[PDB]
Write a structure and sequence with these properties.
Elements (H helix, E strand, L loop, with lengths): L8 E6 L6 H9 L7 H6 L6 E9 L9 E2 L14 E10 L7 H8 L4 E7 L7 H13 L4 E6 L6 H15 L9 E3 L8 H11 L12 E8 L15 E8 L2 E2 L3 E12 L2 E10 L2 E4 L2 E3 L1 E2 L5 E4 L16 E4 L6 E11 L20 E6 L2 E10 L3 E11 L5 E9 L2 E10 L2
Parallel strand pairs: 1-4, 1-5, 5-6, 6-7
Antiparallel strand pairs: 2-3, 2-4, 8-9, 8-17, 9-16, 10-15, 11-12, 11-17, 13-14, 13-16, 18-21, 18-23, 19-20, 19-22, 20-21, 22-23
Bound molecules: guanosine-5'-triphosphate (GTP), guanosine-5'-diphosphate (GDP) and magnesium ion.
Guanosine-5'-triphosphate binds next to helix 1.
Organism: Saccharolobus solfataricus (strain ATCC 35092 / DSM 1617 / JCM 11322 / P2)
Keywords: GTP-binding, Hydrolase, Initiation factor, Magnesium, Metal-binding, Nucleotide-binding, Protein biosynthesis, Zinc
Cofactor: Mg(2+)
Length: about 425
């Protein structure tokens, strides 16, 4: 048998709308990540999708078919049990141009990524470009490019596109990244991709002694109809542990916390609670480390967590000191052009009084520019952000032609 362990690595899946991200994750894991009504009706990803799988290798078989996602080697002709390698998970991003902020919140959780490129569409499409640039900015450099939908193009067309992809990465940080051709729909060459994931998206080093920090991307009321009462539960908070570890019965706090009134003004009150349970997928654990998206059970009133109310928050230990800032100073750089537009325009300099969109960790916040200097801006935010370390990456977006567009990035200076 294989052990039951949490995923140890997060692999982002990014790329232009409908190029096959969610179908690729299904091909690898058997899971369709879309769970929301509007996602199922529109046939598109809207919220961040998630799925897990074990990975193993049949030591008596040849690669790539030796790589498997279940404890069997029957498919490559061996009665031996495959050797367990690791459990992995996928952060399945929306590709739609209006949902770039959601992709960015997911990229803060990624240990590596797969950029999916449809073989039957012109290259490079706007969000092929935009997600590629975003990965570079955020520093997700452990990248595999997957050429999907090769089932509906000729060998000649696929090779032509392959050469344009290599030329696109030429002279960039991604110059050496592998391109793996597959069909997600018909599950062709998926074993080569799994081998690729093992070779190019290794589990990163973690620091388990750093102050525990979880970036929140989901929060739920897990109580369903037709249940007794001795099986009802407090609110659940879901996200990615980016450093340290958490344990059942630990006293924790949610930051910035709850929007409340205090002394005639709007305030954020840190939410203190205790960890009641820890789950990854369908399995319970006594502790949680980086890797995977964890569900943290709490003793909170489920009305506090219902419907992703805490999205963008962080969780730390109760006694941790974490800055919560209404005003932030950013050492910034601007992109040369608006890469996500169908027509790439030049990026205008930042001006005082502009309303910008800031991506910080899993949070997305609007703010007004109160100060512009050559490489430093100061922003008055509409909501405070939790800033758990010095020099956290932020991505800057501006509304251009009715759309939020990524235009730059920087470090939040504390
Ligand atoms: N022929 C062919 N069609 C595919 C393949 N992979 C995905 N598709 C089809 O492409 C369409 C979009 O697939 P999705 O997996 O939903 O693409 P997506 O990238 O997740 O789309 P968004 O999340 O909305 O940005 C669906 O109709 C799929 O069945 C493939 O390998 N070959
Ligand atoms: N820690 C913890 N997590 C839970 C518990 N029950 C459910 N979860 C997790 O919370 C998430 C939401 O649960 P689910 O029943 O699917 O709620 P739904 O998505 O609204 O239908 C899932 O990913 C579960 O793994 C629990 O008792 N403790
Ligand atoms: Mg999708």
């Amino acid at each position: 048998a294989w052990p039951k362990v949490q995923p140890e690595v997060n692999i982002g899946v990014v790329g232009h709308v409908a190029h096959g991200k969610t179908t690729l994750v299904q091909a690898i894991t058997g899971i369709w990540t879309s769970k929301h009504s509007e996602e199922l009706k529109r046939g598109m990803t809207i919220k961040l999708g998630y799925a897990e799988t074990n990975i193993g290798v049949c030591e008596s078989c040849k690669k790539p078919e030796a790589y498997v996602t279940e404890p069997s080697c029957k498919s490559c002709g061996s009665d031996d049990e495959p050797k367990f390698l690791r459990r992995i998970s996928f952060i399945d991003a929306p590709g739609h141009e209006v949902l770039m902020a959601t992709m960015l919140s997911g990229a803060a959780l990624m240990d590596g990524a797969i950029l999916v490129v449809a073989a039957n569409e012109p290259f490079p499409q706007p969000q092929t470009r935009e997600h590629f640039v975003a990965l570079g900015i955020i520093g997700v450099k452990n990248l595999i490019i997957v050429q999907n939908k090769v089932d509906v193009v000729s060998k000649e067309e696929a090779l032509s596109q392959y050469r344009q992809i290599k030329q696109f990465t030429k002279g960039t940080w991604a110059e050496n990244v592998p391109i793996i051709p597959v069909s997600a729909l018909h599950k062709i060459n998926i074993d080569s991709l799994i081998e690729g994931i093992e070779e190019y998206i290794k589990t990163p080093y973690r620091d388990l002694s750093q102050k525990p920090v979880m970036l929140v991307i989901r929060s739920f009321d897990v109580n369903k109809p037709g249940t007794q009462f001795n099986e009802l539960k407090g609110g659940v908070i879901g996200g990615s542990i980016i450093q340290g570890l958490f344990k059942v019965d630990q006293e924790i706090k949610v930051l910035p916390g709850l929007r409340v009134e205090k002394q005639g003004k709007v305030s954020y009150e840190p939410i203190f609670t205790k960890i009641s349970s820890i789950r990854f997928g369908d399995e319970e654990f006594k502790e949680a480390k980086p890797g995977g998206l964890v569900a943290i059970g709490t003793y909170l009133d489920p009305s506090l967590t219902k419907a992703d109310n805490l999205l963008g928050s962080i969780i730390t230990l109760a006694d941790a000191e974490v800055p919560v800032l209404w005003n932030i100073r950013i050492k910034y750089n601007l992109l040369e052009r608006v890469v996500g537009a169908k027509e790439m325009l030049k990026v205008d300099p930042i001006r005082a009084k502009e309303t910008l969109m800031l991506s910080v960790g899993s949070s997305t916040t609007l703010g007004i520019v109160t100060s512009v200097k050559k490489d430093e801006i100061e922003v008055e935010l509409r909501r405070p952000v939790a800033v758990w370390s010095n020099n956290i990456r932020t991505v800057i977006s501006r509304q251009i032609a009715g759309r939020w567009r990524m235009i730059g990035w920087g470090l939040v200076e504390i």
